[PDB]
Symmetry: D2
Subunit: 460 residues, 4 copies
């Protein structure tokens, strides 16, 4: 077996030890493996996967394989691979093209190695994506391959936005499931995973005390809520920026001061518009938005000396790293930790006081400087991914006639009953005990004893 | 002016001082007062109101009056009235029938004084309700009055369930707005209001240290989330019960142990099914469900000696108080605090060790033993109520032809843009500054610079 | 029985109900009652007591009486009495001169009624004091009575400072025990009691949401630590001022921003020295210092409109209330809540926006606007008070010859073994289980299996 | 230069980058460097140092060198060295014998390389020690070298106990400073350092979600307080064991359940004495005691399957690792992470469910699996170490006559004024501003405007 590319195949035994521990932390996902093993619901499935090649993704891959799938795998970020996970999957005879510290060229080459087998399009029929890079490449460069693909299961908020844009423009060629918007994904992974992994990544990259220090979190969606808690629980003094007044109201009620980097919130492109007093007091800035240039050049110029800058949103463009690359000298501390010298770019003084510390070159910090979300949280996301793969593979959209395709070409979420069954396995993994409604109580609140327990309008 | 009934009209000046303070804590609601004063959008409105007669409800009433409405008011709970608020509203010439410590008979007589003026149905044309008692009485006993009513605005989760039941059975006679499911209501009032007011009510009723003690919260919806935080932030060791595995998963991730009062979560009706060891360690139980008999007789028999029992869901039936009234002696400590002697009901021993403390006789504890939610939280709920009253009054359903009525007979929520505008006034009240998107950024995430910023599917 | 003065003797049954509940919350103090009942160690003791006449003080009084003492009692603050507690003690035939809302003249008259019986010095032989007012009056006005007094047991940090000043000046006439510096007092009452009771008092006085709002706590000793936590756990954004850099370092490490009301911390008596930007953002200021004028006139002029001002240190002088009384109009909201109108003092405009809210006229806010510390916390302080009364009464200093007096004239703390026995009863009251050292382990760390477990230098 | 032994000298540039960052996080220590550089107070000092060879210890070493000292250095733990810190110090021409993952034999050889230069006792005259191993070796094996040594500065609680034992037995040969009991050490490092570094080490070793899981912390001294907070802030359900009822009372008031591993707290030596139900629910145990066998064989047999076991007290003996090595198979996951298979010791099944995870082989987990405490915390400890080295070196005990020695042979702490000056530089490093007392205020509380601000009896 040679159909792979990883950093070091000799890490496979370490990877396999970690996979065995992870299996014990992922009861929803291992429950699906155990339930659906007999039935082989993914027999015949040929899955192109593009998602962070971590130990958790390993347990997802081997679940899909155990249910009958074949896969070809790549990471959706240049720094998110755990090399021992990539090695364990390669050593199991699974095609994977992933290492930590890819270049942009190696990243694209790795996605192309999943799409192509022996130099020709693989007989793919399913797509599992995180952030939409693989989905975009298939639509733009391999439209013939999409004729035989039954669906896309999309992990993250940014990738779902890209799918919905394609659906509105009539360019989406196969149906998708929005896995992000299961409650056991969005209100589990996006929030609690960032609570666990943001402070973890800053401590591994810098070993900085956080207690006592001033943080600014840009955004207060699911990731900004979990990020703000990651920092506040360590004793940081956390300020929150938002454009959405409903998310800002939650931040105030959660005990955060809501501030804007710009005077009166107005970003009119000038240095004069920067709240220099506020940014001059900030020791850490974290972007959580999925948006573009929310930590801009003028903010970076105004930050306190030796402030840490990082991004936990899907793509680097949240921070104006291109400005920093043009203007300022980069001194590498160790991989995924750079001192950015604001003195200029004509080399640097090792003793200069005027620098920022950038983590993961502005790429997803939790995965770049630590290991991303823990197994027990990713259990929820990846149980949903498996149920979504089963649903779209069983629906066989590619085999429908043209007029039947038209009725099914949609971006859909999984039913609440499945979201509840995932949650129940998660709860039992903590040793939680869920109460069973009496018939009197089920009748009183108007639900089945078996659920679903809430209307689809319920926000949790 | 004599068209009122309150405890003590001489409390009116104290009530008016508190209303003036509350106005300064309710910028969304006082913003609507200022915006809509010129236009008099509620000129001709005749509103039957049934909601806790607090200082916050006072500011809501005088906002509706300032926009042109006439009202007739009662409380929706026997113990929720603040007698100084009732007095200040009566002293202003507004018809209100409310006092703290009504009997069930006085509670019904107070609703009937709103419905009847000078012994004849009032010419009502709008309904503002909290929990659905007024709505039920109009549908069952005054169907002719609903012919002239343009709509119902319903405050709370339990009242919305009752409206939806009426809509499914085709017994609902007028359209309604679900005010509960604005984000600036459900994920503000229901959660953060209970965070503020639950520990406040237990302290006023008992003056018990909570730190170090064991609590069981039954439910982890919006109210159980806020209630569990109210107790945990004071240092209680909080356990959470749930029937909904998604809410139970959130409890686990929020750092609570999830337990059932029943062995393996199965209530078989018998004493054998009670987890006696768990209930024997609990010092406080709080029901938050909107359901029936979630703290049942067998649980009450098993609780630790001198445990506190209370309910913060809409109706008393959450706790089996009827069992306690049939079997056990009630020793009143002071109003809304009773020792329930488990020795029997043939008088009591003042020195008996074997009792429970019941707050507010099992009625809403935050309103019964304290003052409910604070003005700055109720600002959001009541800004929504005013917007909902304007919308249904302007729509004039009662004046539509039969065939036009059929298209409008619905239970609806307010548009997200209004929810956003309420939240923005709340944020500015904290001194928060919301960032304005650049045109580049608005285009990047596919929203207007003005909002709405989220899809209607977004759960916050 | 007529040898008392209280607000309303008809509250005695309510007071007695609360005392019976408090006994169940005070196991250390009720354990002493049970242990020492046979021995009557305080037979012959005649105790002048001056400490807040709360339900908790009631349980202390009746413990001293049960161990054989007679007492004459007054409160050490004009607003700290709970009238039902004072009534229950009077109705038990115990001399008490206390009500909530005394004037300064009534406060002094009440202490004088304890000192004098039937117009002549009582045959006092022991003193229990909180803050040193009674101790000062005996030294200055009744030196003959001190000839027959065996000791003083002093509750609080401010009173201990006054005793040590008298000891250094050679004016202290009888030995004292510093009850404040038991760990089961200072690191229990001073810290955790203020955590419980500060947010309790602000919510009863104002019903203000605290979440989201800016607080400034002046001080970070035991009371400032508990106060800062009281506010931070509700979601306040808390800033801390300190003069002691070691306490300030703890505040930084506990996740607070450390600020000064004065530019660069320099209080040079000018308006120019005030950090107007900082004070203009503060919604609540709490003084915790035991010092003088730490919230001064220039700070009060600079505070944000409608800010709440309160003191939880022993005496009112922490806030410059005398400035406010000279310059500004006081509008009473309700007892112990005043709007202070910064427009001037020639009456007030009920609708003026430019006011501060002062709680308890600047007197101890927890006791003034709520009920002070909870029974289960005061258990520790008052178990120490009883052990200190036993120790100094048994030592019989008044009966020593002049030369034996000289060797015993000291301010001492209770032994660590007694502090540990109090703590153990407190722990068992939570249902805590303390591990017993093996002989091997006791030998390894160099302690007895029975304790004491720490050297006297240990800070906990 | 060859007078060193490290893992990899090529890590020196990475070490030096991290030392330059650490200097910016250690203002008290770099303030002393700047203040005392002119004076060279340690000119002629020859310091044997034995303390964890981290980046923080690097900044301490180069401060001592900058003040004029020569040093010979080793780590006080086999797994605590950061090999880049060791390399940077060796590359600077400083003798250091340290690497991560020493054997017990290499650990002793490294201490011996400090004591011996070119095969003969070095002309040492000062000792800096953490835990007392170096101190014991000098007293037992190199008594002649102690004739020329002026003093010992001891970092940690366990080492101070060993010094005091030597002083009581009259075997201590040179005076010592207890650096541990500065407030800016004991109530900074021991508590907040463990808050930072315990959850950091468990995450790096296991990547386990902690939220939702059950922890037992054995001990609630400074380390158990910080450890319990490390776990609780991540959402663990934390139970605390203690032998000291005062520390147990603080645990209860801090909102922890206090439990014993043994029924009624009595370890009878037998399996029957184990609370099997409690230990069967624990997912993580952390020892923090400085004591022996506080997580014993019977507890290890009773723990829940797949529980994590770790120690953050000075020495491995807290956990019965000798029992585990005799009975059970050790499967190495990666360095400092072992699965301990409770099936027996005759090899292991890679898929066995019945194991415990042991971190750092039961040695200090924060240093063994992460990087120990952060620079900004160790700033305080190591500013004290430098002040202590200056004081004992200037006192020149070895040069005193026999009779002068007898008056100085003591274990002392640093003066409070120095503890204050360290804390003030720490506070200014957070951007904190300490208020200056007015003369009025200084007189009122009886202190100098310059401090000290507290009596030596004050516990903070
Ligand atoms: N690193 C991880 O492990 C991880 C986990 C899940 C999601 N993600 C990614 O994180 C991003 C956020 O995901 P989410 O689920 O929180 O999305 P979301 O839509 O819930 O939250 C994004 C928030 O950013 C706010 N925002 C937008 N522009 C802003 C601006 N200029 N200033 C301030 N706030 C602004 C929005 O109003 C919104 O509330 C996405 O790119 C998503 O794919 C990463
Ligand atoms: N006191 C107040 O001020 C206040 C404020 C808002 C709402 N309410 C009332 O509180 C109640 C709850 O409102 P909500 O918004 O939280 O509703 P919700 O539907 O969000 O939450 C109720 C929760 O109870 C759970 N539950 C139902 N039966 C249960 C059982 N037997 N055991 C355990 N859990 C069970 C459900 O699964 C659900 O998650 C309603 O009656 C509502 O009208 C009171
Ligand atoms: N209300 C209550 O129930 C209660 C409880 C216990 C104690 N007390 C009283 O509270 C006060 C404080 O007691 P404590 O035990 O916390 O004393 P403490 O000595 O532990 O703390 C007082 C703190 O105030 C600081 N301080 C002094 N002047 C200051 C200034 N100008 N600005 C900022 N900080 C300043 C000191 O440095 C010190 O750390 C005393 O008067 C005590 O008697 C009241
Ligand atoms: N890992 C680190 O970075 C670090 C930092 C500082 C100190 N330390 C070490 O940690 C240890 C503890 O230091 P400390 O400052 O907390 O000491 P401490 O004396 O403050 O606390 C130890 C606690 O253990 C308790 N205890 C003793 N035997 C027990 C038993 N059988 N069960 C339960 N509790 C028991 C004691 O009552 C005491 O309160 C020492 O060995 C010290 O040298 C480690
Ligand atoms: N202070 C208050 N004033 C009026 N209504 C309140 C108050 N506190 C809570 N409520 C309302 O009580 C309703 C339940 O009957 C909740 O939906 C909440 O909106
Ligand atoms: K991970
Ligand atoms: K209220
Ligand atoms: K009290
Ligand atoms: K470190």
């Amino acid at each position: 077996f040679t159909d792979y590319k990883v950093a070091d195949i000799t890490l496979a035994a370490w990877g396999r030890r970690e996979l065995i521990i992870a299996e014990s932390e992922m009861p929803a996902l291992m429950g699906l493996r155990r339930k659906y093993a007999g039935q082989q619901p993914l027999k015949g499935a040929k899955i192109l996967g593009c998602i962070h090649m971590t130990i958790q993704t390993g347990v997802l891959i081997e679940t899909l394989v155990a249910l009958g799938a074949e896969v070809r795998w790549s990471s959706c970020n240049i720094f998110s691979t755990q090399d021992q996970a990539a090695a364990a999957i390669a050593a199991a005879g699974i095609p994977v093209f992933a290492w930590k510290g890819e270049t942009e060229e190696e990243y694209e080459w790795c996605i192309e190695q999943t799409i192509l087998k022996d130099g020709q399009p693989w007989d793919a029929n399913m797509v599992l994506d995180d952030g939409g890079d693989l989905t975009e490449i298939l639509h733009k460069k391999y439209p013939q391959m999409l004729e035989r693909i039954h669906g896309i299961t999309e992990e993250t908020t940014t990738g779902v936005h890209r799918l919905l844009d394609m659906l509105k423009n009539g360019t989406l060629k196969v149906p998708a499931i929005n896995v992000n918007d299961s409650v056991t994904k969005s209100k589990n992974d996006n929030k609690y995973g960032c609570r666990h992994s943001l402070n973890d990544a800053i401590k591994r990259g810098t070993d900085h005390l956080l207690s006592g220090k001033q943080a600014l979190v840009i955004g207060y969606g699911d990731v900004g809520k979990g990020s703000s808690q990651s920092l506040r629980q360590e004793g940081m003094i956390v300020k929150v920026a938002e454009v959405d007044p409903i998310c800002a109201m939650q931040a105030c009620m959660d005990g955060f001061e809501v501030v804007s980097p710009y005077k009166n919130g107005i970003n009119d492109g000038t240095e004069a518009s920067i709240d220099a007093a506020l940014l001059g007091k900030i020791d850490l800035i974290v972007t959580t938005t999925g948006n573009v240039n929310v930590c801009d050049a003028n903010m970076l110029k105004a930050l306190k000396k030796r402030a840490v800058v990082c991004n936990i949103g899907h793509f680097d463009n949240e921070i104006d790293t291109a400005f920093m690359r043009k203007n300022w000298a980069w001194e590498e501390v160790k991989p995924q930790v750079h001192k950015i010298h604001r003195t200029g770019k004509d080399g640097f003084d090792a003793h200069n006081d005027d620098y920022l510390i950038l983590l993961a070159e502005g790429r997803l910090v939790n995965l770049g400087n630590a290991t991303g979300h823990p197994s027990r949280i990713m259990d929820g996301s990846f149980a949903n991914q498996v149920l979504a793969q089963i649903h779209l593979f069983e629906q066989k959209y590619a085999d429908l006639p043209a007029a039947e395709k038209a009725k099914r070409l949609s971006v859909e979420v999984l039913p609440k009953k499945l979201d509840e069954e995932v949650a129940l396995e998660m709860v039992k993994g903590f040793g939680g005990v869920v109460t069973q409604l009496t018939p009197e109580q089920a009748e009183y609140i108007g639900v089945s004893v078996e659920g679903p327990f809430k209307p689809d309008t319920y926000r949790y």
